[PDB]
């Protein structure tokens, strides 16, 4: 219930914390396709997502259950895996941050 959303908010705070900043920083804000020269990004990624958007939704009480929060976080990683070849640093960073997310999300209070 609200208890499960508190667990989600805790995960979100952890993903944004200094402990994980070395691999989380590419996901703090929406991909700036123009600034990075990725002029095909929005043709390949039709539903962009990032941690600032997840945080805005959490602060506005947008998520009604844990599954909705998890779908957004996982969409963010999915976009990274779709756009970027797996040998690029951003994919290694995404996989490590998703490890953090999945292992803690799995500890959802029942």
């Amino acid at each position: 219930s609200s208890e499960q959303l508190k667990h989600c908010n805790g995960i979100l705070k952890e993903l944004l914390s200094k402990k994980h900043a070395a691999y989380a920083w590419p996901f703090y804000k929406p991909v700036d396709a123009s600034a990075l020269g990725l002029h095909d990004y929005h043709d390949i990624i039709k539903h962009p997502m990032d941690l600032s958007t997840v945080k805005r939704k959490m602060e506005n009480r947008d998520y009604r259950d844990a599954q909705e929060f998890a779908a957004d976080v996982r969409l963010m990683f999915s976009n990274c895996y779709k756009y970027n070849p797996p040998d690029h640093d951003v994919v290694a960073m995404a996989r490590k941050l998703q490890d953090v997310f999945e292992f803690r999300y799995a500890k959802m209070p029942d």
Binding site: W25, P26, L38, N84, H88, D89, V90, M93
Partner: peptide
């Protein structure tokens, strides 16, 4: 930051 966007991190 990126040395090369997406490809290689610098920080």
């Amino acid at each position: 930051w990126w040395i090369i966007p997406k490809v290689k991190k610098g920080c």
